[PDB]
Amino acid sequence: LSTWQTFRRLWPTIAPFKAGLIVAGIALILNAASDTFMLSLLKPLLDDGFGATDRSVLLWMPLVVIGLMILRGITSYISSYCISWVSGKVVMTMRRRLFGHMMGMPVAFFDKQSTGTLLSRITYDSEQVASSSSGALITVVREGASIIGLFIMMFYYSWQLSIILVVLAPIVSIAIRVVSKRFRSISKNMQNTMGQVTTSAEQMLKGHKEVLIFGGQEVETKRFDKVSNKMRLQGMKMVSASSISDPIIQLIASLALAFVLYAASFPSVMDSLTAGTITVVFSSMIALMRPLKSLTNVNAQFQRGMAACQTLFAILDSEQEKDEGKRVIDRATGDLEFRNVTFTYPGREVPALRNINLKIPAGKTVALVGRSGSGKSTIASLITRFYDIDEGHILMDGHDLREYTLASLRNQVALVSQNVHLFNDTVANNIAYARTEEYSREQIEEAARMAYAMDFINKMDNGLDTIIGENGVLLSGGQRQRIAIARALLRDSPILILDEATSALDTESERAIQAALDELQKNRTSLVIAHRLSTIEQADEIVVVEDGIIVERGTHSELLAQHGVYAQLHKMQFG
Amino acid sequence: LSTWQTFRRLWPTIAPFKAGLIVAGIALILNAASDTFMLSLLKPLLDDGFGATDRSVLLWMPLVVIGLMILRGITSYISSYCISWVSGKVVMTMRRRLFGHMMGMPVAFFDKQSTGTLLSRITYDSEQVASSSSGALITVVREGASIIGLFIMMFYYSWQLSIILVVLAPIVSIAIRVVSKRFRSISKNMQNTMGQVTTSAEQMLKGHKEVLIFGGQEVETKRFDKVSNKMRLQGMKMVSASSISDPIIQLIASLALAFVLYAASFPSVMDSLTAGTITVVFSSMIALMRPLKSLTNVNAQFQRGMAACQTLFAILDSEQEKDEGKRVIDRATGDLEFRNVTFTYPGREVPALRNINLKIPAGKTVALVGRSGSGKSTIASLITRFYDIDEGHILMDGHDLREYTLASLRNQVALVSQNVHLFNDTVANNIAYARTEEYSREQIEEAARMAYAMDFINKMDNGLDTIIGENGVLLSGGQRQRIAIARALLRDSPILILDEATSALDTESERAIQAALDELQKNRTSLVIAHRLSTIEQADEIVVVEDGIIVERGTHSELLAQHGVYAQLHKMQFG
């Protein structure tokens, strides 16, 4: 209905690759003619050949057959290659635009759904756009050409006979639709009253035990005997109606055939005809049925493919991260403060955090501590603006976070976890994630040294040049951690968020990890979602979170002495 | 493979209705000729008509068209009606045999599955037997005739051209199979390596948060840019291979066409030909493709329908209730005793009952009492032989139950419940379940009187003649109960099993029910799965069951005084 709005929107991504359509269309039309020329040469076969018993006709005829077919194959290959090239570039361009938009959507959007199954729907729906719409282009251009071709040829070789067929065909199909519709109603009235009789009979083996006790078997076989015969007799009633439909439908069309032959008896018609021209006109008229049937499904196909393009524009039209921030931080000095921060995850009520006052001074390290839920993790995500807050402020160097440009803000933070983003590349270029050409191999080796990683790297194929496979295949939990550390080391990031909640602590050489972690925290601001005794007890402040509020605050022994929730958690070893 | 064993088994149920097949087959062959005669008259159309410019040909031709089609419609209707009549009687006969067998299978068999969904599978699979196998009969007889017809006609009108086509066609299809198989392999090798590249790309929006923090967006767009182009370029590699297949396949067949025309140039061939005979032979040779294609799916269809007949013979071949009992009871005097009865439901271990000693003397009434599970219900079902026992004996008049004929045994018991077997009939004939002509309306009215039923029956349309609808529609819980009672009253059944566990007790006129129940129990042996205080407390003995063993036994106050499990249950009011 409005699918041409969608197309006019879509068009200018296609118009760069227009050249390929022109060609495909040309080659398609050639391909249709090639088709109808071959049909045309039944006239010379039956006249110039068998009418004049001329064996020279049957000599060139073979060379024109394989001739046209060679051309028909070539035009077919050209058209289907051109279409695929254009549709391929359109889907790739649309996929790239979609991807670049999503990299820049809210973190909210990413938590509704797996990106692995959104990109399956997107790669599939992008294909269905160009499949359905290019497929429709083909059957317009090609079957339109073939229709025009066969009509012209029909009317040329006997306009008299063709006018008869063009009038009759519509009357005959309308006579058939009317008859086969009148039979669907008669079949649905009988399937309704077969469903009832069948339901009735599928019940009547129930209450078997009552029957055995009372000895009513012979009664119940005579109730089934009657309902079985009734079922079968309804079966006849149904067959005798439906197996009449098709005889009458054919008898209707034979009268049209028989009428056309009778017309060809009258010389006004018959004088235009030959054996050749009658067989070309019936052949070309039968050849019309396929491309007409294709042409009445083209609309369904085009909108089916703009329907999938509707979904991709939905994604491109949904809103990106707010970044009205106007200020640019070179380097945060460090002082970082929450001030009455209340926050609800979107699409719930019952806040995740309430009235969070919390200050992380420059150089210092706070450890967040608490049970599973708590809000430990939420607090960290608010630092980087992965959400935004309902009430209060969060400050970095005495301005709200939202006064800074998202890019500037995030350049300050770094993150360390076990589930660090590893990807198909060398170690060197994992460690310098972006900024590969901004840190030398000399520098990158030092970051890996101090992360206690040259241990397991120098014991590997090509050292720092070693590829890390599909999804980052090669590395154990503890090695990942040290790489994440090496990354956060390399960028001298003034803030550090350290997530211990996901990372595992059995690990051989946890000593090595703690030694690196120590080197990392050295004179840099650090919020820590904490579970290592090692870093909790060493922490400048601890903050205990329970049900989205800070209950306790202070140093290790200070809080342990209070025999409160910090003590409960220290006893349990956090988990 | 062995599906002709199945058919030879099935055959003698069909052979009664053989007449209808003969006719159908005759009419089918006529229908095939009628088809090929119509094709035949292209020769006179193009020769005797347009070859001799004879307008008299185009005058009779119409009358032969509508002629044959009338015959073709008639032969079609005769054949499809005959087939349906025979297949209808075969499925009805098979359904009746299946039903009569199941009414007589073990009660075990009925507890695996709903009979409502077994009879759906059976009514459906019985249809699929006669559908698939009769459908196969049609396409053998009819397409075989049409094949024979078109071959004869082809070789008659030009044996020279026909030998060429008969040799070429096989070479051409084998040339096409070989080519289009060589292209499936090439497409599966490329879908394997498209699946990998696609999986790789659907991953690479993950670890979004790590990316935002570290500012690696521009790096990740350049990883997608490359994998998107790689996906698309594999797309071309795939299209260019598959869109070559079909040109080459057609070019192969055109060479066969072109070869046939070249052969028709040589006078050895060309002298047998005309316009008429060449168009009949190409038409009849194209007309061969459909019935050959049908004939190579006939085997699949016939075994598909003997496969469903396999399942119905499985049911007819599975074993019926054991009835090696040799003794016939006219009327049990009443004395009924369990003696160390141990019993496990088939397909478990952990018995449902252990060492059940229990005696019900003539005229007396025992009430079984216990919690939900218990075995209350199981005990009752063992009385009627709905299962059989692992160890011990159950006696009626000092012989084991198994010495009696199942019919004789069950003639003694009657059953009263709320879930009594009601069915689509008059009240009178529900009350006399079997034995409708063995008790008069005078007698049946008395049974209904004493069951406290003429209350609600005389307040209804046609009284005792009132129909009870689909499943026994009209009756409330308490009315059902009194009818069940009226039934068990009418047959002066020496034993009575009374199930109160299912029946509901809120019911207005429970007074009426208890009054009837009192009239029923009067001087007849009665086991009662008991929950009415009214009948438990009045009972000659009580038997308390827990975890499949009798724990307590004795009269009401006797057991209540023991402050045991009977007391626990009397306090809870049973439920």
8 Å CB contact of B279 and A278: no
CB of A326 within 8 A of CB of A136? Answer: no
Q: Which residue of B has its CA nearest to A65?
A: B258
Question: B78 touching A, CB under 8 A?
Answer: no
Distance CA B353, CA B115 (A): 27
Local structure of A467: helix, strand or coil = strand
Q: Which amino acid is at B137?
A: L
What DSSP assignment string belongs to A412-448?
Answer: H--EE-SS----SEEHHHHHSSS-SSSS-HHHHHHHH
For A65, which of B110, B261, B279 is closest by C-beta distance? B261
Neighbours of A71 (CB within 10 A): 15
Distance CA B375, CA B389 (A): 14
For A95, which of B206, B228, B413 is closest by C-beta distance? B228
- The half-sphere exposure of B120 on its side-chain side, counting CA atoms within 13 A, is 8
Distance CA B367, CA B506 (A): 21
Helices and strands of chain B, counted as H and E runs:
22, 12
Q: Which amino acid is at B554?
A: G
Residues of chain B in contact with residue A503, where contact means CB-CB under 8 angstroms, are none
- Which CATH number is correct for B336-562, 3.40.50.2300, 3.40.190.290, 3.30.70.1520, 3.40.50.300? 3.40.50.300
Bridge partners of A366? A527, A541
Closest CA to A417 of A498, A479, A519, A474: A498
Distance CA B280, CA B286 (A): 10
Distance CA A540, CA A554 (A): 8
φ, ψ (nearest 5 deg) of residue A339: -145, 90
Neighbours of B56 (CB within 10 A): 11
Closest CA to B525 of B375, B384, B360: B360
Neighbours of A533 (CB within 10 A): 13
Distance CA A78, CA A138 (A): 13
Q: Which residue of A has its CA nearest to B69?
A: A251
Residue B111 corresponds to which tokens in the numbers above? 């507890």
Local structure of B538: helix, strand or coil = coil
- Best mutation site among B210, B233, B280, B382 for testing chain A: the one with the most A CBs within 10 Å? B210
Distance CA B222, CA A122 (A): 19
- Last residue before each gap in chain B (C to N over 2.5 A): none
Residues 210-239 of chain B with CB under 8 A from chain A are 210-221, 223-225, 228-229, 231-232, 235-236, 239
What DSSP assignment string belongs to B287-344?
Answer: HTHHHHHHHTSHHHHHHHHHHHHHHHHHHHHSPPPP----B--SS----EEEEEEEE-
Residue A93 corresponds to which tokens in the numbers above? 């361009």
Q: Which amino acid is at A231?
A: M
Answer left, alpha or beta for residue B340, where phi above 0 means left and psi between -120 and 50 means alpha: left
A370 is in an annotated binding site: yes
N- to C-terminal Cα separation, chain A: 58
Domain ranges of chain A: 2-195+237-317, 336-562
Work out whether strand A549-554 and strand A541-546 pair parallel, antiparallel, or are unpaired.
antiparallel
Contacts of A309 (CB under 8 A, 6+ apart): A6, A7, A10, A125, A129, A133
Contacts of A333 (CB under 8 A, 6+ apart): A362, A397, A494
- The half-sphere exposure of A431 on its side-chain side, counting CA atoms within 13 A, is 30
- The half-sphere exposure of A346 on its side-chain side, counting CA atoms within 13 A, is 11
- What is the largest distance, in Å, between two alpha-carbon atoms of chain A? 120
φ, ψ (nearest 5 deg) of residue A514: -60, -35
Question: A76 touching B, CB under 8 A?
Answer: yes
Residue B112 corresponds to which tokens in the numbers above? 């695996």
What residue spans of B432-538 are helical by DSSP H?
Answer: 441-450, 454-457, 477-490, 510-521, 533-537
Distance CA B131, CA B137 (A): 10
Question: A460 touching B, CB under 8 A?
Answer: no
Distance CA B131, CA B306 (A): 11
Local structure of A66: helix, strand or coil = helix
* Residue A51 Cα distances to A280, B275, B346, angstroms: 15, 7, 86
What DSSP assignment string belongs to A39-105?
Answer: HHTHHHIIIIITTTT-TTHHHHHHHHHHHHHHHHHHHHHHHHHHHHHHHHHHHHHHHHHHHHHHTTS
Local structure of B482: helix, strand or coil = helix
Q: Which residue of A has its CA nearest to B44?
A: A275
Residues of chain B in contact with residue A492, where contact means CB-CB under 8 angstroms, are none
For B239, which of A80, A254, A265 is closest by C-beta distance? A80
Q: Which fold has domain A2-195+237-317?
A: ABC transporter transmembrane region fold (1.20.1560)
Local structure of B115: helix, strand or coil = helix
Distance CA B123, CA B91 (A): 8
A374 is in an annotated binding site: yes
Bridge partners of A86? none
Distance CA B469, CA B186 (A): 65
Distance CA B388, CA B411 (A): 18
Question: A433 touching B, CB under 8 A?
Answer: yes
Closest CA to A162 of A287, A281, A3: A281
Q: Which residue of A has its CA nearest to B470?
A: A200
Residues 497-536 of chain A with CB under 8 A from chain B are 497
Q: According to the 3-state scheme, what is the secondary structure of A332-363? A: CCCCEEEEEEEECCCCCCCCCEEEEEEEECCC
Residue B252 corresponds to which tokens in the numbers above? 């192969």
Residue A14 corresponds to which tokens in the numbers above? 């296609």
Neighbours of A13 (CB within 10 A): 14
φ, ψ (nearest 5 deg) of residue B392: 105, -155
CB of B444 within 8 A of CB of B431? Answer: yes
Contacts of B77 (CB under 8 A, 6+ apart): A243, A244, A247
Distance CA A532, CA A518 (A): 12
The angle at the Cα of B40, spanning B36 to B41, to the nearest 5 degrees, equals: 125
8 Å CB contact of A73 and B248: yes
Neighbours of A192 (CB within 10 A): 9
The angle at the Cα of B134, spanning B132 to B139, to the nearest 5 degrees, equals: 95
* Residue A281 Cα distances to A164, A167, B74, B232, angstroms: 11, 15, 31, 45
For A414, which of B207, B213, B250 is closest by C-beta distance? B213
Closest CA to A471 of B82, B382, B206, B33: B206
Q: Which residue of A has its CA nearest to B210?
A: A421
* Residue B148 Cα distances to A57, A208, B143, angstroms: 33, 55, 8
Residue A362 corresponds to which tokens in the numbers above? 């420059």
Answer left, alpha or beta for residue B288, where phi above 0 means left and psi between -120 and 50 means alpha: alpha
CB of B497 within 8 A of CB of B527? Answer: yes
CB of B404 within 8 A of CB of B332? Answer: no
Q: Which amino acid is at A397?
A: D
The angle at the Cα of A26, spanning A21 to A29, to the nearest 5 degrees, equals: 125
Distance CA A523, CA A507 (A): 27
Bridge partners of B404? B327
Distance CA A330, CA A217 (A): 94
Separation in Å, CA of A136 to nearest CA in chain B: 17
Strands of the sheet with B336-343, listed across from one edge = B353-360, B336-343, B391-396, B399-400
8 Å CB contact of B103 and A205: yes
Between A and B, how many CB-CB pairs are < 8 A?
A: 328
8 Å CB contact of A200 and B470: yes
Closest CA to A110 of B195, B231, B211, B220: B211
CB of B9 within 8 A of CB of B133? Answer: no
Strands of the sheet with A391-396, listed across from one edge = A353-360, A336-343, A391-396, A399-400
8 Å CB contact of B228 and A264: no
Distance CA A351, CA A38 (A): 76
Question: B250 touching A, CB under 8 A?
Answer: yes
Q: According to the 3-state scheme, what is the secondary structure of B348-377? A: CCCCCEEEEEEEECCCCEEEEEECCCCCHH
Work out whether strand A495-499 and strand A415-416 pair parallel, antiparallel, or are unpaired.
parallel
B370 is in an annotated binding site: yes
Q: At what angle do helices A217-265 and B57-102 cross, to 10 degrees?
A: 170
Residues of chain B in contact with residue A275, where contact means CB-CB under 8 angstroms, are 46-47, 50-51, 275-276, 279
Q: Which amino acid is at A418?
A: Q
Closest CA to A333 of A498, A496, A522, A494: A494
Q: Which residue of A has its CA nearest to B117?
A: A202
Distance CA B200, CA B315 (A): 52
Q: Which amino acid is at A432?
A: A
Bridge partners of B342? B391
What DSSP assignment string belongs to B376-396?
Answer: HHHHHHHHTTSS--SEEEEEE
- Cα B2 off chain centre by: 23
Q: Which residue of A has its CA nearest to B196?
A: A470
For B214, which of A248, A279, A434 is closest by C-beta distance? A434
A272 is in an annotated binding site: no
8 Å CB contact of B247 and A76: yes
Distance CA B462, CA B426 (A): 10
Bridge partners of A358? A338
Q: Which amino acid is at A106?
A: P
Work out whether strand A541-546 and strand A365-370 pair parallel, antiparallel, or are unpaired.
parallel
Distance CA A86, CA A96 (A): 15
Question: A124 touching B, CB under 8 A?
Answer: no
Residues 266-305 of chain A with CB under 8 A from chain B are 266-267, 270, 273-276, 278-279
Question: B411 touching A, CB under 8 A?
Answer: yes
Distance CA A313, CA A10 (A): 9
CB of B338 within 8 A of CB of B545? Answer: no
CB of B395 within 8 A of CB of B367? Answer: no
Contacts of B345 (CB under 8 A, 6+ apart): B352, B378, B387
Closest CA to A414 of A253, A525, A311, A315: A525
φ, ψ (nearest 5 deg) of residue A400: -60, 150
| Burial class (CB within 10 angstroms; exposed 0-12, middle 13-18, buried 19+) of B2 | exposed
* Residue B88 Cα distances to A95, A111, A168, A238, B126, angstroms: 58, 59, 40, 11, 10
For B202, which of A116, A207, A247 is closest by C-beta distance? A116
CB of A348 within 8 A of CB of A133? Answer: no
Q: Which amino acid is at B486?
A: A
Return the H-helix or E-strand segment holding A365. Answer: strand A365-370
Residue A56 corresponds to which tokens in the numbers above? 């020279």
Return the H-helix or E-strand segment holding B467. Answer: strand B467-468
Q: Which amino acid is at A365?
A: T
φ, ψ (nearest 5 deg) of residue A503: -70, 145
CB of A439 within 8 A of CB of A513? Answer: no
Contacts of B209 (CB under 8 A, 6+ apart): A107, A381, A384, A386, A415
Distance CA A157, CA A273 (A): 8
CB of A285 within 8 A of CB of A173? Answer: no
Neighbours of B429 (CB within 10 A): 19
What DSSP assignment string belongs to B170-226?
Answer: HHHHHHHHHHHHHHHHHHHHHHHHHHHHHHHHHHTT-SHHHHHHHT-HHHHHHHHHH
Q: Which residue of A has its CA nearest to B266?
A: A55
Bridge partners of A415? A497
* Residue B491 Cα distances to A332, A371, B198, B298, angstroms: 99, 73, 77, 57
8 Å CB contact of A202 and B103: no
Distance CA B271, CA B238 (A): 50
Local structure of B113: helix, strand or coil = coil
- Cα B477 off chain centre by: 32
Residue A217 corresponds to which tokens in the numbers above? 């078997």
Task: Compute the 3-state secondary structure of chain B and give helix, strand, coil in percent, each to the nearest 5.
Answer: 65, 10, 25
Distance CA A242, CA A245 (A): 5
Distance CA A367, CA A388 (A): 22
Question: B413 touching A, CB under 8 A?
Answer: yes
Question: B11 touching A, CB under 8 A?
Answer: no
Four-residue CA torsion sign, A201, A202, A205, A207: negative
Return the H-helix or E-strand segment holding A254. Answer: helix A217-265
Q: Which amino acid is at B522?
A: K
- Best mutation site among B103, B123, B223 for testing chain A: the one with the most A CBs within 10 Å? B103
Distance CA B377, CA A288 (A): 74
For B81, which of A243, A264, A471 is closest by C-beta distance? A243
